[PDB]
């Protein structure tokens, strides 16, 4: 974990002592106090629970039970029972009648055709209620306590030993605009897509409240009428199409435990911890200097940023000075807060959002600093 500096906590003349820390996933923040064991606090999981279904989108349809009806000129329109039943796709047209096809005169005869629509493979779409975004914080000594938080319920308080009663006021900060997005499910797999990207799909859809498949003509073809007959074809599968279009969109891993919870990879939680009156200990870290190197090179994140992993040899516990410049001054944005390494020969993550175009990421100071080239469009 990573201990808090002095400015990160404040002890009052009266009342209690408050801590302020922005905790991010896969990392941990520890708080120390004289004559007391350490308090380790971490953000374990940020999840979504059963987001409401909005619209299914059929990408593979199957036609069944075919019926065609005929009317000779001046005998009116052709009517099937299946025109009323919503299960069936129906077309109305007119055919070339005459002698060869047993009518009474020459001209266009009304012909109607219906077939039962059955959706073989569909794509579900879910809305995310942001006031329901769950996040879980674990806090243990060195006697564990697990704290289930909601986006709405940001204030959760917990009993302890020595530290007494704590009260945590926490806010959630999402990695991606969930009001411009959909959670999309296709069989075993799922992704985060644009709302508009789905709303602009040319496939048949069915609202979350159920109902009939709409605009069935996207996957059904009614070939030109003949004498008294029409060939109807269900179009081919379109899985390859969606799957190819679903590439440029990050996937969302399913849960191993509950298997109905969606885990967000990014995002962070900002916390204010109300504590009893007690004196903590502020570890003041030193900006790293000596040998560092890339465990994992800077690589794209699929949402406009880039993540790297570095290791330190000589630097003890030390802050890592990450900056992205065009010698000059940086123009980028350091995503990762407290980029600090606890133990030598230990790997650490650094995320960053560079300026669009060509820029250089610089990590560390002096000879032993690291430099990486980066382009962004």
């Amino acid at each position, epitope marked *: 974990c990573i201990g808090i500096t002095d400015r990160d906590f404040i002890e009052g003349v009266h009342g209690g002592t408050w801590v302020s820390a922005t905790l991010e996933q896969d990392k941990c923040v520890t708080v120390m106090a004289p004559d007391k064991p350490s308090l380790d606090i971490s953000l374990e999981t940020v999840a979504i629970d059963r987001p409401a279904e909005v619209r299914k989108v059929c990408y593979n349809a199957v036609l069944t039970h*075919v019926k065609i009806n*005929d*009317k000779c000129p001046s005998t009116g329109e052709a009517h099937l029972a299946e025109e009323n039943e919503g299960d069936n796709a129906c077309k109305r047209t007119y055919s070339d009648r005459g002698w060869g096809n047993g009518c009474g005169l020459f001209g266009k005869g009304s012909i109607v055709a219906c077939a039962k629509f059955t959706c073989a493979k569909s794509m579900s779409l879910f809305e995310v209620d942001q006031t329901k975004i769950q996040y879980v914080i674990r806090a243990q000594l060195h006697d564990i306590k697990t704290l289930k938080f909601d986006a709405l319920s940001g204030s959760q308080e917990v009993e302890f030993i020595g530290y007494g009663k704590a009260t945590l006021e926490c806010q959630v900060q999402t990695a991606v605009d969930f009001g411009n997005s959909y959670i999309a499910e296709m069989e075993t797999e799922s992704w985060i897509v644009d709302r508009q990207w789905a709303q602009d799909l040319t496939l048949p859809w069915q609202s979350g409240s159920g109902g009939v498949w709409r605009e069935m003509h996207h996957l059904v073809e009614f070939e030109p009428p003949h*004498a*008294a007959t029409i*060939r109807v074809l269900a179009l081919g599968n379109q899985e390859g199409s969606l799957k190819t279009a679903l590439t440029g969109a990050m996937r969302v891993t399913k849960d191993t435990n509950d298997n109905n919870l969606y885990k967000l990879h990014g995002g962070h939680v900002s916390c204010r911890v109300k504590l009893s009156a007690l004196t903590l200990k502020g570890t003041s870290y030193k900006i790293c200097t000596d040998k560092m190197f890339f465990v994992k090179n800077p690589t794209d994140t699929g949402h406009g940023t880039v993540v790297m992993q570095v290791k330190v040899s000589k630097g003890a516990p030390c802050r890592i000075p990450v900056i992205v410049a065009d010698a000059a001054i940086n123009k980028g944005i350091l995503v990762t807060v407290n980029p600090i390494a606890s133990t030598n020969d230990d790997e650490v993550l650094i995320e960053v959002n560079p300026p669009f175009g060509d820029s250089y990421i610089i990590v560390g100071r002096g000879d032993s600093r690291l430099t990486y080239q980066w382009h962004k469009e």
Partner: antibody
Amino acid sequence: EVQLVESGPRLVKPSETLSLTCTVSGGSTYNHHWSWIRQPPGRGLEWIGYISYSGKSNYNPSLKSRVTISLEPSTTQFSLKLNSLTAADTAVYYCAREYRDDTNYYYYSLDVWGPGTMVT
Amino acid sequence: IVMTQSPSTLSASVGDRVTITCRASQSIGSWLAWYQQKPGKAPKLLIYKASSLESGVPSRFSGSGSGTEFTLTISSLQPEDFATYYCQQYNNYSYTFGPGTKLEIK
């Protein structure tokens, strides 16, 4: 909407001829096979035979010798002719359509039926 | 070609999973249809092509079979279903009916 209705004389003297007429309403008699069936009260159904528009008819082997079925595409009413008739023929006579999709191989049926005529 | 049904008579209760059998004089593939006629009216088509169903038939009804033997089934018997049931043959030419199993209340 498609419906079938048969008619004629509901009372005939033995060893004579028979003239039933199945009029087809709400549909074109260009398609399908146009079929007749009978049912002697107390007993079940026996398939009599069918006729295409083109005129390729086909009858039940036990009766063909005494049966003619004509097809008028004009007035849209296919008709049944049973000569040398006896009291065994006294029954209910349904005119029904078989089916033909052809362009799709969705085939099998006897779809629309008439109420049937009681012939003696 | 001749069709034979078994039973010809049945006494069942509203809810019974009833099963009527129908066998042909030879192999006719999957070509077989069932019919439901209540006394007075004209026969009404229920099943077509062995197992496929016609729009207008309750889902309790279910047929199966290919080749030589075919069966009907009503999952949970219902009032209107008390009727006489027939079967059909294809030949590629000349068709044939069955004797008809009369369904009757217990």
